[PDB]
Design a protein around this motif. Structure first.
Motif, short mmCIF file in Angstrom:
data_model
loop_
_atom_site.label_atom_id
_atom_site.label_comp_id
_atom_site.label_asym_id
_atom_site.label_seq_id
_atom_site.Cartn_x
_atom_site.Cartn_y
_atom_site.Cartn_z
N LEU A 134 0.42 5.45 0.12
CA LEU A 134 0.38 6.41 0.49
C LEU A 134 1.34 7.76 -0.71
O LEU A 134 2.42 7.45 -0.23
CB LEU A 134 -0.07 7.35 1.36
CG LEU A 134 -0.76 8.41 1.97
CD1 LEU A 134 -1.96 8.01 1.47
CD2 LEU A 134 -1.48 8.47 3.58
N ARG A 189 0.91 -1.18 0.19
CA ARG A 189 -0.19 -0.26 -0.22
C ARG A 189 0.77 0.86 0.05
O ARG A 189 2.10 1.37 1.09
CB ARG A 189 -0.90 0.16 1.28
CG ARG A 189 -1.90 -1.12 1.05
CD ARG A 189 -2.43 -0.60 1.87
NE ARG A 189 -3.71 -0.33 1.74
CZ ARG A 189 -4.94 -0.14 0.34
NH1 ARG A 189 -5.36 -1.77 -0.10
NH2 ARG A 189 -5.36 1.11 0.67
N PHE A 207 6.00 3.07 6.18
CA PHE A 207 5.08 3.50 7.38
C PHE A 207 4.24 1.64 7.50
O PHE A 207 3.13 1.55 5.68
CB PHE A 207 4.52 4.06 6.51
CG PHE A 207 3.29 5.15 6.97
CD1 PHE A 207 3.83 6.17 7.72
CD2 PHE A 207 2.17 5.18 7.56
CE1 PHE A 207 3.69 7.06 8.42
CE2 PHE A 207 1.31 5.53 8.29
CZ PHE A 207 1.42 6.26 8.83
N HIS A 218 2.06 1.38 8.78
CA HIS A 218 0.06 1.66 9.71
C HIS A 218 -0.43 2.08 8.93
O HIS A 218 -0.94 3.25 9.20
CB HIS A 218 0.28 2.50 10.53
CG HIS A 218 0.92 3.26 11.86
ND1 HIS A 218 2.45 2.49 11.91
CD2 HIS A 218 1.02 1.64 13.11
CE1 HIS A 218 2.69 1.39 13.43
NE2 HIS A 218 2.24 1.03 13.71
N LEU A 219 -0.26 1.20 7.15
CA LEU A 219 -0.74 1.86 6.10
C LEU A 219 -2.21 0.36 5.57
O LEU A 219 -2.99 0.41 4.90
CB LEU A 219 -0.40 2.05 5.04
CG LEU A 219 0.07 3.63 4.68
CD1 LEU A 219 0.77 3.83 3.07
CD2 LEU A 219 -0.99 4.74 4.93
N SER A 220 -1.54 -0.52 6.92
CA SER A 220 -2.48 -2.03 6.31
C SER A 220 -1.78 -2.46 7.86
O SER A 220 -1.37 -2.38 8.28
CB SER A 220 -1.44 -3.01 5.00
OG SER A 220 -1.90 -3.64 5.40
#
Ligand SMILES: Nc1ncnc2c1ncn2[C@@H]1O[C@H](CO)[C@@H](NC(=O)[C@@H](N)CO)[C@H]1O
Ligand SMILES: Nc1ncnc2c1ncn2[C@@H]1O[C@H](CO)[C@@H](NC(=O)[C@@H](N)CO)[C@H]1O
Lengths: 143, 147
Positions: free
Chosen positions: A4, A2, A81, A83-85
């Motif tokens: 962003l 993922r 990162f 914390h996107l999944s």
């Protein structure tokens, strides 16, 4: 995977401490960093990506490069990162794929920066707010 | 629904232009907004959420409230963020769900702020970097994913 993508005026980070047992080794200077007029790529490597690291990396490089072209950015910043999944790949594979993407973007000719893998980090970002300033990509390998 | 929670020192936004033909009606003073020591909730309402807006809103209120409690955030900022997902819900439905979520968090007793719906906005944020300063939450109707 993922991704962003945030087209920003700047991105600045500050490492707090390691978030896992074996993080990326870092020198003192690597504890902080900043880049301006930059396309920030927050990336969460998912366990599904473990199936074919090269495939997912090549596609990620391609998608990020295309967006950079669309927002007219020459600077790109790879920001680990997690914390996107919720379905994350094991640390070793995650760091490997993140480095692949980082290197792949440099290979396209962009000015690329990145934050160290495996740490808790505070960060500041200023999104430009244009129509294409915030975009995302879900990339999953199948080969 | 996909939610990205960022415990921050502050959140500031600036409306740049409207992203929809008829964005949420707002006044001049709302073109710029800011909130201090806040749990910023970037939310993307997904197509699947259309199946049960109330169910999703309720679970979203609960998940967001739980994190706020964990990091001791007294202030919460509902920030519509469409591109957090690739399968978006109809704009009108998204607006509705975000209003319901806002109302729910307010009822919980938090100091709630929000960014206007339907606009392209620049923004500044400063993530505190603590262990729970960045979290992800996925909320969908039970009928669309036994969870
Ligand atoms: N699957 C994954 N994808 C991307 N990054 C991952 C990862 N698994 C581990 N990491 C890295 O380890 C730190 C703690 O999980 C992660 N740290 C972070 O996500 C910081 N932004 C927290 O402040 C990240 O550096
Ligand atoms: N499914 C959805 N979930 C959350 N928000 C949604 C939405 N569909 C439409 N919006 C709102 O309309 C603006 C343009 O898509 C969106 N704008 C934004 O996401 C800004 N951050 C862009 O700068 C948002 O206000």
């Amino acid at each position: 995977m993922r991704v962003l993508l945030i087209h920003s005026d700047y991105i600045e980070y500050e490492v707090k401490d390691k978030a896992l047992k074996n993080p990326e080794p870092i020198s003192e200077d690597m504890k902080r960093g900043r880049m301006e007029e930059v396309l920030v790529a927050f990336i969460s490597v998912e366990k599904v990506d473990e199936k074919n690291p090269e495939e997912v990396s090549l596609k990620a490089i391609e998608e990020i490069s295309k967006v950079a072209e669309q927002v007219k950015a020459e600077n790109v910043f790879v920001y680990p990162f997690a914390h996107l999944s919720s379905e994350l790949a094991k640390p070793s594979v995650a760091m490997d794929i993140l480095n692949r993407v980082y290197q792949g973007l440099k290979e396209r000719g962009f000015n690329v920066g990145k934050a160290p893998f495996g740490y808790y980090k505070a960060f500041k970002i200023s999104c430009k707010g244009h129509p294409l300033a915030e975009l995302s990509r879900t990339i999953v390998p199948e080969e």
